[PDB]
A paper describes a structure:
PRPP is formed from ATP and D-ribose-5-phosphate (R5P) by the phosphoribosyl pyrophosphate synthetases (PRSs). The human PRS family, which has 3 isoforms (hPRS1, hPRS2 and hPRS3), belongs to the class I PRSs that requires divalent metal ions such as Mg2+ as the activator, inorganic phosphate ion for activity, and ATP or dATP as the diphosphoryl donor.
We determined the crystal structures of the E43T, D65N, A87T, M115T and Q133P mutations at a resolution of 3.0 Å, 2.14 Å, 3.3 Å, 2.11 Å and 2.74 Å, respectively, with 2 molecules in each asymmetric unit. Overall, the structures of all the five structures are highly similar to that of the wild type PRS1 with RMSD listed in S2 Table. In the D65N structure, the salt bridge between Asp65 and Lys34 in the PRS1 structure is replaced by a hydrogen bond between Asn65 and Lys34, which might reduce the restraint of the ATP binding motif β2–3.
Author numbering:
A (entry chain A), C (entry chain A), E (entry chain A): 3 to 195, 203 to 313
B (entry chain B), D (entry chain B), F (entry chain B): 3 to 195, 203 to 317
Amino acid sequence: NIKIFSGSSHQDLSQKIADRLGLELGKVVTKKFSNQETCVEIGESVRGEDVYIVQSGCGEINNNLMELLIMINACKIASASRVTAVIPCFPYARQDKKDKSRAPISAKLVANMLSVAGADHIITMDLHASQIQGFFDIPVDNLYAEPAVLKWIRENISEWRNCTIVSPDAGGAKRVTSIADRLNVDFALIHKEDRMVLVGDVKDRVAILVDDMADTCGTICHAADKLLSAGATRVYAILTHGIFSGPAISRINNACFEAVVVTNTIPQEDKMKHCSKIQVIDISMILAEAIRRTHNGESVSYLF
Amino acid sequence: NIKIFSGSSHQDLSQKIADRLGLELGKVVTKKFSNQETCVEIGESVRGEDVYIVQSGCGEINNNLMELLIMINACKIASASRVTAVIPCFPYARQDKKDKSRAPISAKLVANMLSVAGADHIITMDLHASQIQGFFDIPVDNLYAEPAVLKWIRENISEWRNCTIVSPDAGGAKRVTSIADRLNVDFALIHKEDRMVLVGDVKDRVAILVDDMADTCGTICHAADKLLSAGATRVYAILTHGIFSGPAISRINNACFEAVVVTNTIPQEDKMKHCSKIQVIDISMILAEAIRRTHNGESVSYLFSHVP
Amino acid sequence: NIKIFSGSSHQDLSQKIADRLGLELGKVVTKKFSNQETCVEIGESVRGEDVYIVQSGCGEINNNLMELLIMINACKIASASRVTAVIPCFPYARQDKKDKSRAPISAKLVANMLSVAGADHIITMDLHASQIQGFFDIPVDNLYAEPAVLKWIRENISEWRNCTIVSPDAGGAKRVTSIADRLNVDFALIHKEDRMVLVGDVKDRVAILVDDMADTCGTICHAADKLLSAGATRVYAILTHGIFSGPAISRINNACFEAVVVTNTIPQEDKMKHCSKIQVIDISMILAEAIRRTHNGESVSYLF
Amino acid sequence: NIKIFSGSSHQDLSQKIADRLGLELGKVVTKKFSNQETCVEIGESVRGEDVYIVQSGCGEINNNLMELLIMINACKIASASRVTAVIPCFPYARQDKKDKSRAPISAKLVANMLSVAGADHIITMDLHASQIQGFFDIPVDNLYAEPAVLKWIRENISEWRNCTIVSPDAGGAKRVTSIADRLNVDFALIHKEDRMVLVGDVKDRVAILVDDMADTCGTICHAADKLLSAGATRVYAILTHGIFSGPAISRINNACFEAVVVTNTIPQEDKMKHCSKIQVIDISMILAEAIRRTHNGESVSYLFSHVP
Amino acid sequence: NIKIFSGSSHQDLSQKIADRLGLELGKVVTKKFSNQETCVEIGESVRGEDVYIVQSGCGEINNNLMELLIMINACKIASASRVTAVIPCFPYARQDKKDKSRAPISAKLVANMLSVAGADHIITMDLHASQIQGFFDIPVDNLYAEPAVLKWIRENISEWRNCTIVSPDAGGAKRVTSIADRLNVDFALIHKEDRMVLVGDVKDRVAILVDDMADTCGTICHAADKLLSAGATRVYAILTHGIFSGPAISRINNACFEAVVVTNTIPQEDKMKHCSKIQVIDISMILAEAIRRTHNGESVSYLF
Amino acid sequence: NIKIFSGSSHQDLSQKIADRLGLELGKVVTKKFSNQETCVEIGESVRGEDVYIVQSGCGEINNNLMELLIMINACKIASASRVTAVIPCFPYARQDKKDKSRAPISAKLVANMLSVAGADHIITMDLHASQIQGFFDIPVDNLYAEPAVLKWIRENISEWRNCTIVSPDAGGAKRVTSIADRLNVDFALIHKEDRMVLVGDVKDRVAILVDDMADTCGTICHAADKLLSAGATRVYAILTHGIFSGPAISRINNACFEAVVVTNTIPQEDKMKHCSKIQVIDISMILAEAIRRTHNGESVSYLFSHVP
């Protein structure tokens, strides 16, 4: 009744999930034609099944999105009973408002595409902005890495009881004050005027940079400089979505991060070989549980 | 081709906008029946017209909201060419996410209601969260009070070049840094844990609390005290939307504000009689200009940084 | 699997319904903020449940409608399996046509709002016009109070065998001729030219004014005058929806109604203290049965 | 910009409307294939045009209906600027509620079909139930035959000032009281239980049976007898839509009507050859005027009480 | 749980289907009023049932389509759990593109009508063009008569091992080369320049004209002439949809067809009396199986 | 009122079309962020404008497709009056049926995506299957390369009056018979079973392979050999869409074609440097004319048989 399928190539997360549920991943013939078109073939009947498609990480977002959309649609027209898109890192999430510009709200576009492709339900982790749930008319379960991160901080930072949770930018304020509050420690915020300004106290205390995602890590790496200058004992960076593209990985080594922690919502095994300070929090149990619970009509909020 | 209607009763804003466009407000037969049901009847043909309906202010939200939806509906089935909802302060805007709860995203519900009623276009001012534009599939013009605010600051606060812009909560960080950067001054931030923590320097500077909206004012009042305790010379509060429900006017009369500045997106006239700290920025010209441009197909973005 | 929730404050009907089904009403934190906005919080998981929201009667129709809409939506995005709005008295039902005016069809608006809020199913009683079922694309079960009213007439009017069922206006013709036919008695109709005209026979016979609803009762009260003048032995008024707002309750005492009968689709307990002639027909069993039967895939038409 | 097309065949009404607008009917290649499928091909560009399609009358409803939907479809995907369905007599209108049965609301189905085919606007005359406007989300203009009827009465019935307007059923009460009030005369009402009961005074007065439509005429014929038995001097029947299917023309030839008056919303020419009681009010001017106004963005409500 | 209903009058197929499933056909009061309007009344509760409406064949396509639409809608508003339209021969299928003209895409119109009427699922046989499945957003199971036709050819044509499958027109190429390939025999194609051109080899070999449907049979009958002229031993015509309207039946006798084979997707019993060469392949088992399998969440592709 | 934008980068076609209309391409800020996400920002107001977005050619389909959808989206919420997607070669067009498999109908998915993004109109050239117009509910103009092809043949092949038009597969039958009939010449057909069978006469005639698109060219290359073996004097291949991915240019350099003719619906400039057999028909005038007509409300059908 429950069927789990994976996006192209990136199967490690999807395999971890299927394992925890006692299932094998569904058969699918996924490829790319010589001329770049996404080719998909669901290799088994999904008629009347509860289907979960777990998003791939070939690091080509548009190919990954089209592949997801094609699979949702194939399952829908093959009379699956229900189709859930499981999308740990939601594409174009950062493009969720116009911001004074004549820009697309791409995240709303993506929501509409998933909807028209035929998704009945979304499962995702740490949406860039919670309002993104408002982009759908179908139910969205938005899981949080927060509890997994708190656990890690307490269990890996000896001075965590007097540390400071720092936001790389102005927008990240709500996220850090939530974490700092849970830990009962100080928070501080960085703003790029360029010159970086710091408000709050970091002097003679462990500083933990917390952000939802880091791409090129330009901001996260400058942030670490400023924090050192301001007398931070040691600096950590915690990101739930480790995109780490471009100069990201080199800047990280070239920076003073005692460590950089991410979840495996994006595949990290390649980069970990090229970056010693990276540690991954496995989130496959959270996702498996959300699927199992979604499937059984059981409470998901429990994982929040 | 252009036609402007007012929701019920608080017709001031509606009248100021119509005046600035050279128009009379359209005729409406708009009562509430014995059982509390909204009555409407568009008293003139709107056939083939570019219709703008301005949300009425009497502060009873569900009535104002239903009245607006009914008028949108009425104009659409009477074959208006286009129907734009002009909603200076967007209802249920503070209900735009789940916040780890089994809650409605009521702002999305409101957007869906406006959509099915038949709105083709929305004009609003300072959405509580910009993502709310993402709640519609029709175009939304979200005007800013910032240019009018920056102007008020520069012309009313002698020490503006040395002031600090302060957010009363963590969620207002981007809004205040944006103002601080434009003015080229400092910003600070208050975070409520039953205590407030302040980060950023305010000592021996004028502090300006800037928020999108103030309701019961519990927060801004405590923020002022906190700011004075941290050494602020004096304290201003500048809100775009002055809801001021319940005990707010009493909290303001007693608070250590030098002044509380709000726009007239929400009617303030009666509130001002009981509260001398309240000053009002008129935003009718910005709304009037957004309507005029929308109707002409002219750039509306000009107003995002420019007071007309 | 079945979950029943009530609208704000008005719980008496909703409680009667939940009792007959052997259920407790679902937990919900409903309130109104200082600034008039409707605040709702579903206080329990409704995931995979068959949910019925029974409409409140705070007598503020717009607050009651918004509260209903918010609750439907909250249940939908919390992955309820099905959401039914149970709405004994359908708001804006009288606004169901333009009637030569440039008016809204508000009842169609309300249907659209409920639909977009995410209702899968409607249960209602005595719609002002049956065409209102046409306003939805989702199924509507429109229950009738007719059988409950016939029972009451036979059991409370000694002369019912030679009485006359009278319609207050021209529009109510179909409703009364149906009742008069079932009873095998005379019907008559009133029209407001103002001066009231009466067609049909009422002389020396019990006259029963039957209407779907009465608000201010101005029409129902003038009607009773005319009927007396025309030689009605005694006059009764039967209304399925007793709104009774404004001068309604006083005009009723000030009128010659042997009695005024209503159902409890709208809360009547307050007004009954202020009006001796009012008697209520409990319709909670009809509604409970419709819910139970809706839930079990059992026939509802049986109650018609 | 204005373009008018006729459904199949009964092109009279369509031609009268086009004539009154100064137009030729648009070219259509419109046959029915060997297997009973409708064929259409719009014989001219409609790109960017204000298109009106007038429903054809041949009385085979499902064919007329499918033909209309296919032409709506054809014009929309050929990029017409707007497509209006002109449907003098609305199909399945008597199927607009469930009536305590497991029945379709076929009129709602028809509305959905017209909508998905791509109609932007509907123009119709005397919907069987006004609520049918509520079946669409697009605007509907529901024109009335009343002004044309009132005029016919005043000019053809000497005793109109002392007549009685009579509804043949309980469902027509509002329609007849409306006419009676305007004329300032009496109204009465027939209710069929296998017997008819009459309420209201008709004695020694001319009785005018007024209904929205007559089909087999079983009812109006029995109503006439009933009215004469109650002392009516003579009896008229005035319908807006003269369906007259099956044995109707035979029931009319034998009935005690002085006259049976219908509009030409349904073609009557062939029926009149076999029935001398039938007179026809031409409604093409009302339709022509509704189209002209719709196209110009001019008030259509004027016609609700005013014969053009 | 499974309920099967039939379109008007034409019950033979629908009865065959209901038999194979061990069911009686559902009660429905279907008729045509004096004034041509389709009258339907579902004569039993379908609440919570899995409903299949099998399309009638009164040979009046518009009446058959409206009747189907009305029945789908009636079941939907009576809270059927699921409604499938079973439509062996899809109306307006030949009107599925503009073809350089200002024509309707009627097949898309029909798809939209069925969808808005409330169909959840379509079952059909040999769509004129497979892209027609693209006209729906709901699942379509498109059954093939191909296997039934191959069986018949092998079992009724002695020379089938060296026969030629011939397409009446250019458009039918894909269909015949598929059949010819499966049989491992020759294919040929006819084109109307009018004068008919033939490409491919038919000399001294049994020629089988294969087409998805034949209406007036003008094309199929001229085709047979040309094939004789080209030295075809004997000519057969195989059509899955035998419409056979107008001069069709007479032209067939007047032609040299050793036989004309059709399926019973359209009622053939009347015409078979007037045409000796007609043989029907019963497809009621294929349809019953597709319904049963659709109902049980079982694989349908198996029948392909 | 008319505004033309180009997708990313392969801006040639876009520029040729804009040139022919007398326009400059609209300003776009269009990059791809570090993580492969498409960036767009319409660099000018499109408010109230008739917007045409021309699909960019860089051949990475999912990126081109997402870029197009994002720009459609951007223009619609910036209140463009209308947004038309100009998609010379329609993506996933070869995925427009199930083919007895559990496959997506990806072309229908693409249509749905274009629709929800907010396209009001599509302009395309030679859809792989005409039924694809049936995948949209908005109007689609599917232009033909045939008139330009017929012209190329008549002016470049001396023996065109005695040539044979050949389909490389069973699915192209209608397309080649259509060309053969117009030219009044023969047609033939290849069907791949691992072998090819040819039906129709090509002996001692020039053979012209005509297809909608060529990708890896495996098929057309084998078809040429087959055609020469059957006695064709020489062999041409004429495609509307020259995808030429993977080993195609190498298959062409080695194949027995006299010439391979393609339109510029797909950019060919770089491909031509490595392949001297390739000639290019410019279709920018046809696209330019379809846009101009669409904007003016003028007949577009003229181009279906007439090279502008």
